[PDB]
């Protein structure tokens, strides 16, 4: 196999600011007849991949060029010359020097942008779940930077761990922020055997947890 | 206007197989190589052969001799891949993709097919609707939303007021839990507006062949 390496993830990088996304090939991509085998692609959620260089240097149609590519024959480079929110995603390199031809892993391309607290909203189960046998309580943790965060939950007061799955958005293409949502699923059995229910949000913006509950009463 | 248009999802059993299509125009279609590329849930992408349909010639990815096959129809301008003995490892979307030239590169893209290896049958989701309970939620803004539990495989298209609801809306991703997939989405409007101005959830679940709307109602 001729091995791509790349990292999977690469520095936040500030809106308007250069990137740089590097490759590294286990053996030369330069043909006999002078073509370095070398692609970058983009690939943003729930997209088909977007071609931005094709051998090594040369600008897609289609592509902006604020895109560029370099390298010797070993080492390549994308570069980005002014970053904008809307290039989140993951890059890839590729060859078709030799069969196999081959991908790169993909580095993820995120933006850094100022710190904001998360918008925290909870609700109870619907009657309809209930009706099931089934409470399922969610908070949702909406439009929040960084990225890191921390989410609790506590019933009648007390720490939960059991029952909980949390689920977070890519980073959004328009405002660079993230989201997270976090689930307590319980036995109806369970959930009218206590009264407070409570989802405590922990980051960075501000040393005090944000807290929002319902009493099922 | 070149386009390539890929058939649709499929769910199937392991041990069979499934043959994918990718419908091109707006070229001539004998002129141009065709790829295909794999890519698993979660996953990057694997490279699986190209095929020129002047030819008919094609380039294989050994790693898959006795798995996949590329075939193309001249009359109907559609290339093919079948994918035999399935296994779960075999889950993923494919793609199919164009070389716009001599070693230039994949220019125009299809959609992708979603391609499911599972003996798990196919379950509709359920649909609970997300209300403010006890805590006057903020004032400004309201955030409301949507539960979608237990469906089976993926995946669901949820939307608010039909697509007309698009701004602050967060669909969160999928997680699978006891064969089963759960997901949720929240809608933020501004407070005024609700339930003056009605907001309801809309899931698609095009493998049951089923559809669920939810008034949020306080």
């Known amino acids: 196999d001729i091995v791509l390496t790349q990292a999977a993830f690469s520095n936040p990088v500030t809106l308007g600011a250069s990137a740089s996304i590097s490759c590294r090939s286990s053996?030369?991509?330069?043909?006999?007849?002078?073509?370095?085998?070398m692609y970058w692609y983009l690939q943003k959620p729930g997209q088909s991949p977007q071609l931005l260089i094709y051998?090594?240097?040369k600008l897609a149609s289609g592509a902006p060029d604020r895109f560029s590519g370099s390298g010797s024959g070993t080492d390549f480079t994308l570069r980005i010359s002014r970053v904008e929110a809307e290039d989140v995603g993951v890059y890839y390199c590729?060859?078709?020097?030799?069969?196999?031809?081959?991908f790169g892993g993909g580095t993820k391309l995120e933006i850094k942008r100022a710190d904001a607290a998360p918008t925290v909203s909870i609700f109870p189960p619907s009657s309809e779940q209930l009706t099931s046998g089934g409470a399922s309580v969610v908070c949702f943790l909406n439009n929040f930077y960084p990225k890191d965060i921390n989410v609790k939950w506590k019933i009648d007061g007390s720490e939960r761990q059991n029952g909980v799955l949390n689920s977070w958005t890519d980073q959004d293409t328009k405002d660079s922020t993230y989201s997270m949502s976090s689930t307590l699923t319980l036995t109806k059995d369970e959930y009218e055997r206590h009264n407070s229910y409570t989802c405590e949000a922990t980051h960075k913006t501000s040393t005090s947890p944000i807290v929002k509950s319902f009493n099922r009463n | 206007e070149v386009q390539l248009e890929e058939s649709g999802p499929e769910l199937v059993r392991p041990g069979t197989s499934v043959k994918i299509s990718c419908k091109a125009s707006?070229?001539?279609?004998?002129?141009?190589?065709l790829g295909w590329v794999k890519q698993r849930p979660g996953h990057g992408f694997e490279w699986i052969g190209d095929?020129?349909?002047?030819?008919?010639?094609?380039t294989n990815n050994e790693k898959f001799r006795g798995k996949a096959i590329l075939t193309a129809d001249t009359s109907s301008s559609t290339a093919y891949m079948q994918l035999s003995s399935l296994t779960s490892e075999d889950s993923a979307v494919y793609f199919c993709?164009?070389?716009?030239?001599?070693?230039?590169?994949?220019?125009?893209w299809g959609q992708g097919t979603s391609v499911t290896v599972s003996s798990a049958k196919t379950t509709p989701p359920s649909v609970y609707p997300l209300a403010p309970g006890s805590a006057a939620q903020t004032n400004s803004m309201v955030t409301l939303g949507c539960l979608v539990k237990g469906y089976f495989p993926e995946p669901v298209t949820v939307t608010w007021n039909s697509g007309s609801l698009s701004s602050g809306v967060h669909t969160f991703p999928a997680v699978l839990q006891s064969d089963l997939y759960t997901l949720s989405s929240s809608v933020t409007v501004p407070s005024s507006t609700w339930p003056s101005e009605t907001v309801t959830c809309n899931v698609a679940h095009p493998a049951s062949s089923t559809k669920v709307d939810k008034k949020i109602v306080p």
């Open positions: 993709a164009r070389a716009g030239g001599y070693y230039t590169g994949g220019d125009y």
């Open positions: 707006g070229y001539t279609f004998t002129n141009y190589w």
């Open positions: 095929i020129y349909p002047g030819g008919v010639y094609t």
């Open positions: 053996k030369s991509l330069l043909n006999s007849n002078g073509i370095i085998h």
């Open positions: 051998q090594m240097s």
């Open positions: 590729a060859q078709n020097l030799e069969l196999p031809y081959t």
